[PDB]
Amino acid sequence: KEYVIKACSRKLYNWLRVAPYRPDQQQGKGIRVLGIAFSSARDHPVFCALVNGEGEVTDFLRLPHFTEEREKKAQDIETLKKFLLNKKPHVVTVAGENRDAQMLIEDVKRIVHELDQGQQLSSIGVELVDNELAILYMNSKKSEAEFRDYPPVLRQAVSLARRIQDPLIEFAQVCSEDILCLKFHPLQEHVVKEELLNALYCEFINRVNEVGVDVNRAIAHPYSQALIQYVCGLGPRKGTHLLKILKQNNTRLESRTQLVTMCHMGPKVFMNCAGFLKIDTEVLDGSRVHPETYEWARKMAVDALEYDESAEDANPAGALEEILENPERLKDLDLDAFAEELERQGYGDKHITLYDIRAELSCRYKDLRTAYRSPNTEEIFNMLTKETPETFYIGKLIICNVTGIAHIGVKTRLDNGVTGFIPTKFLSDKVVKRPEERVKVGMTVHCRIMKIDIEKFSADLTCRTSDLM
Amino acid sequence: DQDNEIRATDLPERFQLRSIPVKGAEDDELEEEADWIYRNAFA
RNA sequence: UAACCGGAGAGGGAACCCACU
C-alpha cells in the first residue's frame, strides 16, 4: 500500500506540475484560446469555443462539414476559412480521438498556417494538447452550471480552453471524490483510498502554496473562485466563509491585513496565511512577505539602492518600484550582517529566508509552475489513443482487422484503434501473389505480436500458425 | 451547528483536522516524540 | 488516402329483418 501510494503520488506530482500556455512563454493579457472539441469528425457537429486569456468564454461556433462526404475536399477547408475569418484566436487547442483526428488537426494546421489564420494577418501555431482531464471535466457539475443549452462537446472545448489556461484551476474546481475519477495506477482500487485522497489533498495544498492564489479574481470570476479551499490554514468551511464575506459586504482587498482590520479572520490564522494570501495592489501584500517582515524587506530594499527612507511603506518609491522592475543592487546587502541584526531584533536566525525576501522584493508573486511542455510523439500517442506501448508485450495474441493493402503490405487496425503495418515477410510475398491465404481483408484475425512500433504506425503480426506458439 | 468550531476558532482549519483526536504536543513529549519519529521514520 | 438513411395488432356493442342446411 505504501509503494502503491508512492507510485500514485509520483504520477500525481507529475500531473501536479502544471504548465498552461502563456503568450510567447512570458495587446491584452493572456492568450485568446480557441479550443476545438470534436464529436466524430465524420460529418458530425464539431464545436469551437474561443475563451479569452482573462478566463471567460467569449465566442463559439459549430462545424458539421468535414472531408460525411467522400469527395468534397475543400468543404471543411471552406468552413474553416469562414469560421476562422469569424474568430480572432491567439492559440488553437485541438483535441484528439484517432489518427484520422491527427490528420484533421494537420488539415486545420494547413488552413491556419498557409493563410495566416492565427491572427487574420500572421500565423500563430496550433498546439497539440492531450484530452483526458477535459473529457472528465466537461461532465462535472461546475461545467453544467456555466451553460445549459449546448451539448458536452462545447463543454469539452471549454474544458480544453480552461486546461490551456491553467490546470490547477481545473484541479481547484473539482471537489476532493472528483480526484478519484482520474486513474493513475491500475492497483489503487484494491487498496484504501482515504490516505490516497489525503495525499492528493496534500499535493494540491503543496501546489497551491508554491504557486499562490489571487483574491481579486475570486470575487469576479466563478472559474477563479473556490480557490481558498487549498490555502494554508483556510479549509473548505473557512474558504467558503471567506468567499461569503467577500461577496456579502462587497469587500475588496487593498492589503493583506484587510481580514484583521475588519475582523474577518483570526489573528493566528491570519499569521498562518500571512505568506499565502496575495492581492493585486501595500506593495508587499501580493507576495510571501509577512507583516513581521514588512520593515525588513523594505529595509533591504532601501539598502538595495542607497536611498534615504521616507518612513518607507510606500514613500521611498525609487527603492521599492525600481527593485520590482529589476534587481538593482544585491552586493550592497550582506546576509551575514542582516542575520546578525535579525539575531538582535526580530529574534530569529533568518539568513536564507532573507534570500526569499530578496526574491520577493525582486519579483513578487512568483509561480513555481513548470514551463509548457509540447507533445512529443509518445505523449501524443498516449494522449489521442489512450493506450501506452508498455501495456502491449511480445508474446501476446492480438486481433487485427486488415483494412487496406499498401501496395502488397497488410495495413490494418486493432480493437484499441492503432494502425499496424504487417510486412510481406509474414504475409509470404515480396511482390508475388498476396496474403489472402494468410489473412482476410476486412475481417479480423488473431496474430502473435513480435514488434511494438505503434508510434510509427508499424506492428509485427505473424500470419503463420507456426509462429503463434 | 458543527461549522462554528471550525470558523470561529483561533486555530487553523487544516491544523484542526490534522490533530483532531488529540490536539497539541507538549514540551516534555517533544524530545521523546522526536526520538520516536527518528526511530520510526527509518525502516 | 473515404462511404447517410429505419417507426407496427389493429377495431365497439345492442336491437330488428332476410336467407341457408
Please spell the DSSP secondary structure of chain B, one letter per residue. --SHHHHSSSS-HHHHTTSSSS----SHHHHHHHHHHHHHS--
The rounded distance, in Å, linking the Cα atoms of A408 and A429 is 8
Instruction: State the Cα angle at A314 between A309 and A317, rounded to 5°.
Output: 65
Distance from CA of B18 to the nearest CA of A (A): 11
Determine the nucleotide nearest to A406 by Cα–C1' distance.
Answer: C1
Look up residue A177 and give its three cell numbers: 471524490
Query: What 3-state class would DSSP assign to A343?
Result: coil
Q: How far is the CA of A388 from the C1' of C21 (A)?
A: 87
φ/ψ (deg, to 5) at A459: -150, 135
- Select from A372, A224, A205 the least CA-distant residue to A276: A205
Tell me which DSSP letter residue A404 carries. E
Q: How far A294 CA lies from chain B's nearest CA (Å)?
A: 23
CB of A152 within 8 Å of any CB in chain B? no
Check if the beta carbon of residue A89 is closer than 8 Å to that of residue A34: yes
Residue A235 contacts B where some CB pair is shorter than 8 Å: yes
Contact A234 B10 (CB under 8 A): no
Contacts of B3 in chain A (CB under 8 A): 237
- Report whether A129 contacts A19 (CB < 8 A): no
- Burial class of residue A463 in the structure, from the number of CB atoms within 10 Å of its CB (0-12 exposed, 13-18 middle, 19+ buried): buried
Torsions phi, psi for B41 (to 5 deg): -80, -5
Alpha-carbon Rg for chain A in angstroms: 28
Q: What angle do CA A355, A360, A363 make, to 5 degrees?
A: 120
Cβ contacts (< 8 Å) between B14 and chain A: which residues? 205, 232-235
Distance CA A465, CA A4 (A): 40
Helix segments in A262-350, DSSP class H: 267-272, 294-303, 317-325, 335-342
Residue the block writes with cell 501476446: A396
- For the CA atoms of B36, B39, B41, B43, the dihedral, rounded to the nearest 10 degrees, stands at -150
Q: Which residue has the cell 489518427?
A: A99
Residue A63: name the closest of A86, A44, A50, A87 by CA: A44
Quick check: A228 and B7 in contact, CB under 8 A? no
How many CB atoms within 10 Å of residue B11? 17
Query: Rounded to whole angstroms, how far apart are CA atoms A74 and A403?
Result: 25
Length of chain B: 43
Burial class of A164 by CB neighbour count within 10 A (0 to 12, 13 to 18, 19+): buried
Q: Is the CB of A64 under 7 A from strand C?
A: no
Distance, CA of A229 to CA of A160 (rounded, Å): 23
Q: Does at least one atom of strand C sit less than 7 Å from the CB of A42?
A: yes
Say yes or no for a CB contact (<8 Å) between A234 and B15: no
A224, amino acid identity: S
CA atoms within 13 A on the CB side of A95: 28
Give the whole-angstrom CA distance, residue A60 versus residue A154: 8
- CA distances, A267 to each of A105, A156, A270 (Å): 54, 43, 5
Return d(Cα A213, Cα A205) in angstroms, integer.
Answer: 11
> Which residue in the block uniquely carries the three cell numbers 525609487?
A318
Expressed in angstroms, the distance from the first to the final Cα of chain B is: 43
* Residue A399 CB partners (closer than 8 Å, separation 6+): A414, A415, A444, A445, A446, A447
Q: Are A168 and A18 in contact (CB under 8 A)?
A: yes
- The β-bridge relationship of strands A410-414 and A420-422 is antiparallel
* CA A203 from centroid of its chain's CA atoms: 16
A331's CB contacts (< 8 A; 6+ apart) are: none
- Amino acid (1-letter code) at residue A51: V
How were these coordinates obtained? Answer: cryo-EM
Handedness of CA A109, A114, A120, A123 (dihedral sign): positive
* Contact at CB, B9 and A236, closer than 8 angstroms: no
d(CA B28, CA A49): 61
Q: Maximum Cα–Cα distance for chain B, whole Å?
A: 43
Which one-letter amino acid corresponds to residue A70? R
Residue type, A443: M
- Cross-strand bridge partners of residue A231: A234
Task: Please state at what angle helix A317-325 crosses helix A353-362, rounded to 10 degrees.
Answer: 90
Q: What is the DSSP string of A12-67?
A: HHHHTS-----GGG---SS--EEEEE-S-SSSS--EEEEEETTTEEEEEE------
Half-sphere exposure of A251 (CA within 13 A, CB side): 21
Closest chain B residue to A268 measured between Cα atoms?
A: B10
Which of these, A137, A122, A148, A123, lies nearest to A172 by C-alpha position? A137
Instruction: Determine contact: A228 vs chain B, CB below 8 A.
Output: no
The SS3 of residue A449 is strand
The reply to whether residue A272 touches residue B11, judged by beta carbons under 8 angstroms, is: no
Q: Which residue has the cell 511494438?
A: A452
Q: Which three cell numbers stand for residue A222?
A: 466563478
In this complex, is the C-beta atom of A423 within 8 Å of any C-beta atom belonging to chain B? no
Task: Name residues 111-140 of chain A with a Cβ under 7 Å from nucleic strand C.
Answer: none
Which has the closest alpha carbon to A134: A183, A82, A107, A95? A95
> Distance between CA A132 and CA A15 in Å, rounded?
12
3-state SS class at A152: helix
Residue A436 beta carbon within 7 A of nucleic strand C: no
Interface contact B10-A268, CB threshold 8 A: yes
Q: For residue A292, give the nearest of A253, A342, A334 by alpha carbon.
A: A342
Strands A91-94 and A410-414: unpaired
The answer to whether the beta carbon of residue A322 comes closer than 7 angstroms to any atom of strand C is: no
For residue A50, what are the contacts with CB-CB under 8 A and spacing of at least 6?
A32, A33, A34, A35, A57, A58, A59, A60, A87, A88, A89, A161
Contact between the CB of A100 and strand C at under 7 Å: yes
Q: For chain A, report the end-to-end CA distance as a whole number of angstroms.
A: 37
Contact B12 A232 (CB under 8 A): yes
Burial of B43 (0-12, 13-18, 19+ CB in 10 A): exposed
- Cα–Cα distance, A83 to A341 (Å, whole number): 64
Which residues lie below 8 Å from residue A157, measured CB to CB, with a gap of 6+?
A35, A36, A37, A47, A48, A49, A60, A95
Q: How far apart are CA A199 and CA A191, in angstroms?
A: 14
Contact A289, A275 (CB under 8 A): yes
Helices (H) and strands (E) in chain A, counts: 16, 10
- Structural element, H or E, at residue A401: strand A397-405
Kindly state the DSSP code that residue A252 receives in the 8-state scheme. Answer: -
Residues of B in contact with A1 (CB under 8 A): none
Separation of CA A92 and C1' C11 in angstroms? Answer: 63
- CB-based contacts of A99, cutoff 8 Å, min separation 6: A384, A385, A417, A419, A457
Phi first, then psi, for residue A56 (nearest 5°) are: -155, 140
